[PDB]
Point group: C3
Chain length 306, copies 3
């Protein structure tokens, strides 16, 4: 099996410095050797250098770096599309979660029936009209869902984007910090999610069983796993931009990834929002990067029983 | 929906200095803004000043500060009774857990059919004849339960207390540090409880289901939630006087509070035993205070999915 | 009603210094008083001094200290056999896990129909032909299981060992760091195990139920509990030689011990691999030793509900 690794050192989906160093931190934590050890044939695309945009002024005096985020995601989408074309499962290292616009667009280009597992403390589904931060890393899903497009105005640099996913084709796992307009969107478009509360009730084994019944119970589909490291409790993943108490345990995160691998359908994976600069110690930065590597490795077959 | 907040800075139910600063620490952690944000209309009664009793000698050369605990609880009960009659759900901030004598007596004064959910590492059900510490914060339930009163002698300053509640009307959640005479009492009077072991077996969802079926399965009753911060594992709630390893997780504490809110019946809440002076660091004190606010907020409707 | 305590301060099953101070550390954390309070009549054999072997060269240029480990276990087996013969449940404090060769051989010498519950992050079932470390604490099970013996060469100092326990008579709980040859052995011999993943799926209550169904579902048998402290998550048991992320919680460990007690069949217990020199602080050392005392005390009747 063949896996392409793409560093996407992007930070302009939000305002905190340092998430552009996530890809190097994850690499420094041993990613490539771990993937090789599993039998993965590897193509390293390196870290992309995204084309800047001069005078990328706020959109509507709120939305930050719109043209830079639109253009970086267009370029990323091109690399993901071509790698998925050439037979690779695509691992994209971030970088902030606005990059999911690019990886899911590029993925869907060649696999239009793909489904999405979004593992995250946050829903990332604000629109340009509901965001209260202006940060695109909290809006990427709104640009991707067919059913929402009449409520998403067109941003400078975003005209290449055509939503390719139905709201029935994404499931969230781990929600615990949702804005009211996001909650409204989830309920109003009947988007399925398992919050931390649902995990407390069902247990992660049932959560995964129901996730796959919703997504692939009728038919096999390529799976896009978009994993925000802040889905994990901050005690485990402290080096990240928007930590929220009461997250996944280590064991729960491994279990999610093991179940992803067990479908045999994993086609692309994002590992986003590792920001080593927000660690208060080198150890905090390395434990976060090591946890990122554990997620990716388990998603491609690393087991706890050997 | 109206919420009264009462500071009860009492420490004479036990011997460790500093729990009288519990109410200020909780207020400082942002309680009042959190309750407003949920839509609660608030009346802050401030921090009560309890009348001292001169020459409050030990009772039976063992029980410490009996008259002061008795009189402070008499005064607290009056405030609680008044706030309930004016339509407020009553939040009392402690302070050591002997204040539940006052809040439950005042609550039961005009709601004699109330039920009690007692969240705690301890049963607090020693009598003056079984306590080996002499600390009234470890005896409050013995004064409240009608079936026990033939076995509870009359302490100086306690004559105003009339046990209003049946032993079928209290459920414990989180027990893990129980004296042999307390275990006898729980068994002998058939008092229902879910120890940490029961949570390990059943899961917190079923624990709450069985709690409400036992208490409100046949009729709606105002709920008194007496929440001792030491129900949480000491890694989460270190700033407290009697910590015991193996406690509730954060998620379990939130889930309890969420289910309390979901009944619609919460009528009074005690948040006791936060002692900021027992934290070894400012960060330990503040995480303990912040956890207290999360419990209260979740008990009045804060959710994890927005 | 009677418990023997044997200190086995052995370190030559592995290469890290200090695990020979496990027994003293566990005793200093209050083991004997805790056992007495449960009503255990106690015989303390102290710490054994094992006979050295001159010129104990590597076996096959790989296996370290073979004769010293063999002889020390022969001597330990003799002490365990006598204690079990005289009516004592035998508690052996390690020391590295190669001592289970001695404690299980000595136990079986008096109770041949014993069964084994092996709580560990590791399977410890490498043979001299599969070990990649050469450390005998990672091989003890291979010397004990009847079905494996054609694949186990005879080591100098090991000829006294009579391996008559069946592979159907051991169950593992907690596995998460298993070598590929150990995985092959476990599958090829149909040895039953509950990995951390199984615990994630089933919950520790069902794990224990199924463990006892496999071992004592048809008849009562004396139970040998061999408990490697590194089964627990490293955050709870840091002072140990091979820590592995994602282990048992405190509550899961207590629950295992409680169910061991509840069978009424506990006949011997090993508490191994506490190495206080690997703690980065005195706090980490004492937390690990206190956890070891909790495991042993719970295995002999300490409950969380009193
Ligand atoms: N919804 C947000 C947005 O900016 O839209 C607001 N903020 C959450 C929090 C909610 C209430 C307290 C103040 N802020 C983060 C989130 C983006 C997460 C992006 B990611 O990729 O890490 O998930
Ligand atoms: N049972 C106690 C009492 O004093 O009666 C004794 N002590 C428990 C513990 C038992 C093991 C040996 C050391 N002591 C705490 C408890 C009071 C807790 C009051 B609270 O409001 O925090 O719950
Ligand atoms: N299988 C081992 C052996 O030495 O045989 C290899 N080693 C850990 C090794 C490190 C990284 C690669 C995979 N695992 C520990 C185990 C022995 C544990 C003995 B015990 O009593 O602590 O359980
Ligand atoms: Mn995200
Ligand atoms: Mn997030
Ligand atoms: Mn209490
Ligand atoms: Mn308590
Ligand atoms: Mn081990
Ligand atoms: Mn071991």
């Amino acid at each position: 099996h063949s896996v392409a690794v793409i560093g996407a050192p992007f930070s302009q989906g939000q305002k905190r410095k340092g998430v552009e160093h996530g890809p190097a931190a994850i690499r420094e934590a041993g990613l490539m050797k771990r993937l090789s050890s599993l039998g993965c044939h590897l193509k390293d695309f390196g870290d992309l250098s995204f084309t800047p945009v001069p005078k990328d002024d706020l959109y509507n005096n709120l939305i930050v770096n719109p043209r830079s985020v639109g253009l970086a995601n267009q370029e990323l989408a091109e690399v993901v599309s071509r790698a998925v074309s050439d037979g690779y499962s695509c691992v994209t290292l971030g970088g902030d979660h606005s990059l999911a616009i690019g990886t899911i667009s590029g993925h869907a280009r060649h696999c239009p029936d793909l489904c999405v597992v979004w593992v995250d403390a946050h829903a990332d589904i604000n629109t340009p009209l509901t965001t209260s931060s202006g940060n695109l890393h909290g809006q990427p899903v709104s640009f991707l869902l067919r059913e929402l497009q009449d409520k998403v105005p067109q941003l400078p640099g975003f005209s290449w984007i055509k939503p390719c996913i139905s709201s029935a084709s994404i499931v969230y796992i781990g929600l615990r910090d949702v804005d009211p307009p996001e909650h409204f969107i989830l309920k109003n478009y009947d988007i399925q999610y398992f919050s931390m509360r649902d995990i407390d009730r069902l247990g992660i084994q049932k959560v995964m069983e129901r996730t796959f019944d919703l997504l692939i119970g009728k038919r096999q589909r390529p799976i896009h796993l978009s994993f925000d490291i802040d889905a994990f409790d901050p005690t485990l993943a402290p080096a990240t931009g928007t930590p929220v108490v009461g997250g996944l345990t280590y064991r729960e995160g491994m279990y999610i990834a093991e179940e992803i691998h067990n479908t045999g359908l994993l086609s692309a994976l994002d590992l986003v929002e590792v920001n080593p600069q927000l660690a208060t110690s080198e150890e905090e930065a390395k434990t976060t990067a090591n946890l990122a590597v554990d997620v990716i490795a388990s998603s491609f077959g690393q087991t706890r029983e050997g």
